[PDB]
Amino acid sequence: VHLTPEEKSAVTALWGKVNVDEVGGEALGRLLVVYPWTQRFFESFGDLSTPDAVMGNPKVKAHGKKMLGAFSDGLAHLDNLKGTFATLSELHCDKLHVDPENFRLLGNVLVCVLAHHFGKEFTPPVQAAYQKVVAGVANALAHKYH
Amino acid sequence: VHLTPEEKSAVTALWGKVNVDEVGGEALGRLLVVYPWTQRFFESFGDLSTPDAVMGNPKVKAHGKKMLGAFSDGLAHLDNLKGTFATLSELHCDKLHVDPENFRLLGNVLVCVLAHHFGKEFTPPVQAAYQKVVAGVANALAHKYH
Amino acid sequence: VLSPADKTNVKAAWGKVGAHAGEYGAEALERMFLSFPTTKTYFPHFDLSHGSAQVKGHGKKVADALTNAVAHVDDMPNALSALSDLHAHKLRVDPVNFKLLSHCLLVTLAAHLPAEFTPAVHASLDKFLASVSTVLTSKYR
Amino acid sequence: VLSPADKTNVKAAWGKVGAHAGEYGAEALERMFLSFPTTKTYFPHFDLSHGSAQVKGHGKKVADALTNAVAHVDDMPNALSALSDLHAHKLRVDPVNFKLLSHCLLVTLAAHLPAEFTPAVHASLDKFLASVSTVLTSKYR
Numbered sequence: 001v002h003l004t005p006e007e008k009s010a011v012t013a014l015w016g017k018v019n020v021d022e023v024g025g026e027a028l029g030r031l032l033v034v035y036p037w038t039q040r041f042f043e044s045f046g047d048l049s050t051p052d053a054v055m056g057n058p059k060v061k062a063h064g065k066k067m068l069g070a071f072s073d074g075l076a077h078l079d080n081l082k083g084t085f086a087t088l089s090e091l092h093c094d095k096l097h098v099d100p101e102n103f104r105l106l107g108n109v110l111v112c113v114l115a116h117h118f119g120k121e122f123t124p125p126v127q128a129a130y131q132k133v134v135a136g137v138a139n140a141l142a143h144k145y146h
Numbered sequence: 147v148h149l150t151p152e153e154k155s156a157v158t159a160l161w162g163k164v165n166v167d168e169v170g171g172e173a174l175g176r177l178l179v180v181y182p183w184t185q186r187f188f189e190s191f192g193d194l195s196t197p198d199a200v201m202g203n204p205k206v207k208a209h210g211k212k213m214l215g216a217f218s219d220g221l222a223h224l225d226n227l228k229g230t231f232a233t234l235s236e237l238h239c240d241k242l243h244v245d246p247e248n249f250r251l252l253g254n255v256l257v258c259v260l261a262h263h264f265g266k267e268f269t270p271p272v273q274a275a276y277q278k279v280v281a282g283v284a285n286a287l288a289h290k291y292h
Numbered sequence: 293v294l295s296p297a298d299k300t301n302v303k304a305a306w307g308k309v310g311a312h313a314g315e316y317g318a319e320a321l322e323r324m325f326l327s328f329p330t331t332k333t334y335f336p337h338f339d340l341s342h343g344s345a346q347v348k349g350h351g352k353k354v355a356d357a358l359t360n361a362v363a364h365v366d367d368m369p370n371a372l373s374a375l376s377d378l379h380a381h382k383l384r385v386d387p388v389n390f391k392l393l394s395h396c397l398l399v400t401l402a403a404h405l406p407a408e409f410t411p412a413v414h415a416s417l418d419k420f421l422a423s424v425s426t427v428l429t430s431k432y433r
Numbered sequence: 434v435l436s437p438a439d440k441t442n443v444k445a446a447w448g449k450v451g452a453h454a455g456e457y458g459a460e461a462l463e464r465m466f467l468s469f470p471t472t473k474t475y476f477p478h479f480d481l482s483h484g485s486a487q488v489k490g491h492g493k494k495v496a497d498a499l500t501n502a503v504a505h506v507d508d509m510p511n512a513l514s515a516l517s518d519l520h521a522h523k524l525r526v527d528p529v530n531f532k533l534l535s536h537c538l539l540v541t542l543a544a545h546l547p548a549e550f551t552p553a554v555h556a557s558l559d560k561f562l563a564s565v566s567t568v569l570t571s572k573y574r
């Protein structure tokens with residue numbers, strides 16, 4: 001949607017400190033652990049039997065990195081999230097049929113991961129800015145449903 | 147969104163038989179009875195203490211008629227639901243702060259009311275067409291949130 | 293939390309439905325598949341076309357589970373335990389999907405019960421199906 | 434359905450939080466108000482600005498309810514009965530709103546518990562808060 005300059009400031013400053021090789025795997029991993037029906041979409045991924053197995057599964061890590069790549073792209077195109085996520089929308093909606101509530105769930109997991117990694121720095125206004133971002137990404141990813 | 151010609155046919159044919167002075171009140175009334183937190187937005191409406199009181203409350207009936215008026219407008223503008231519902235969106239989102247899940251709930255209640263009134267005529271393909279319509283209306287009404 | 297009036301309402305609706313229950317279960321399933329196409333992916337091995345013997349057979353199973361819940365309404369978690377294990381552990385059914393089938397079950401009842409589908413009974417049925425859904429999504433791990 | 438591991442996990446998290454619980458409750462409330470502005474309408478008579486004495490006081494109430502739930506985890510419906518009556522009957526709180534506060538409570542814990550907020554404990558805490566929310570939305574009528 002429309003972030004204020006203060007919110008854009010909050011988002012971009014934090015994001016520059018994010019380890020993009022790790023945070024994606026961490027968020028995808030927690031998604032599969034916390035909301036286990038999501039493992040349904042990852043049957044080829046091998047061992048997902050325990051939280052430790054999920055988090056250390058190299059395919060989970062690799063795929064989380066790709067997923068976070070798309071978030072980063074969204075961050076650079078906040079005023080055109082629909083266009084940025086058009087092909088991913090077709091993929092997640094028309095091909096995979098993932099219910100869009102799971103997009104909201106992953107966004108909130110990402111928020112929890114950022115909170116966990118950044119602690120006090122992840123202030124309530126910073127979180128509010130991120131909640132606008134993940135809401136916008138989930139909405140754009142679900143466009144093929146609307 | 148995009149209804150097929152068959153779906154547009156299903157919707158418009160049924161709708162021509164709808165009593166627009168009654169179905170709105172019936173749907174708003176059931177919304178307040180089935181999901182009672184929604185009564186929070188209708189404190190000025192007087193007696194809402196029982197299902198009979200709700201359904202026979204003339205303000206519920208009057209307001210349901212206005213609500214259904216907006217649905218009818220949406221039916222005539224399916225390929226521009228966003229524009230049609232722009233002012234209602236500002237009202238329901240920015241002024242009233244109704245959570246958009248309640249738009250989905252009212253749509254589904256309307257579906258139940260149509261099923262109840264039309265019986266066998268409300269076939270599964272007819273319902274599917276209506277589910278696209280109420281989804282589109284809820285999404286357009288919630289645009290100010292996105 | 294189902295009230296005494298809710299139980300009476302749900303029992304009365306079940307009574308009127310009568311031996312149509314399995315047929316109505318199949319109709320609710322069909323309505324879900326057409327209205328909410330994402331749900332179709334849980335049945336990749338079913339033919340979901342109109343008149344499918346597999347959907348008819350499954351509708352009967354769904355109906356039988358719901359009536360078992362009605363018959364044991366004051367202890368649904370126990371009655372539906374094996375079914376909740378199945379839907380969560382083996383099938384991995386997205387919890388959102390229970391609201392969709394529950395809505396279709398209501399629409400089916402409404403389309404077949406003109407006298408009984410009053411606002412009060414509608415409310416009672418929604419609570420019952422919500423209660424069944426709560427149990428069916430209670431076993432994720 | 435909370436497992437024995439879930440209860441141990443939730444108890445351990447409560448233990449580390451310690452006497453910060455009320456302060457954390459207030460922070461979760463503030464996070465909800467800023468992230469999810471629709472929730473603000475339930476508190477028209479509160480000042481919701483940063484540092485508000487009313488939000489601090491309410492955070493303590495929220496924390497005390499949650500710890501009462503932890504202390505009586507095997508009978509949450511009984512422990513939270515009066516609170517569920519209040520939120521449903523008097524306040525008419527939209528059930529969606531419980532997921533929003535529950536998320537903010539998690540974020541607050543995560544921002545304050547670096548060692549404890551493991552994926553396993555995160556899962557256990559989400560189930561606990563979902564269980565508390567199920568009870569708190571169990572009394573609509």
Ligand code: HEM
Pocket residue numbers: 038041042066067068069070071088092096098102103104106107137138141
């Ligand atoms: C909400 C934000 C999400 C974003 C930004 C995102 C992004 C992506 C990206 C960038 C890919 C790689 C596509 C490619 O290889 O070209 C992908 C693939 C995939 N995603 Fe997601 N995703 C999201 C949510 C989800 C959720 C919630 C699920 C399931 C519960 C899911 C399931 C999958 C699966 C199964 C693939 C592999 C598809 C294939 O390789 O055939 N995604 N996603």
Ligand code: HEM
Pocket residue numbers: 184187188212213214215216217234238242244248249250252253283284287
């Ligand atoms: C989802 C489809 C909905 C449609 C098409 C719709 C339509 C309308 C319309 C046409 C009006 C009249 C505005 C005017 O007087 O100019 C209205 C007013 C109102 N609506 Fe809705 N509505 C919907 C959902 C809801 C829901 C779910 C709620 C609450 C749970 C709600 C609460 C209200 C209230 C409180 C008013 C009166 C506002 C005022 O007069 O100040 N609406 N709506």
Ligand code: HEM
Pocket residue numbers: 331334335353354357358375378379383385389390393394424425428
């Ligand atoms: C809402 C109440 C529901 C009830 C009462 C119910 C009941 C049942 C029953 C009785 C069975 C057969 C159990 C057995 O054979 O041991 C079954 C199987 C199944 N259900 Fe449900 N169900 C419900 C919701 C759902 C939903 C929402 C979905 C997915 C969208 C779903 C997907 C399935 C699948 C995929 C099977 C296995 C079919 C097969 O492979 O034979 N169910 N259900």
Ligand code: HEM
Pocket residue numbers: 472475476494495498499516519520524526530531534535565566569
């Ligand atoms: C999620 C777990 C929640 C817990 C444990 C909780 C707990 C409490 C407690 C302990 C009280 C005070 C009870 C009393 O004074 O007797 C309270 C009051 C209240 N709660 Fe909650 N609550 C929760 C969720 C929510 C949500 C989601 C909302 C709305 C978005 C909400 C809105 C309110 C309001 C408006 C009051 C009354 C404030 C006043 O007028 O003094 N609560 N809650």
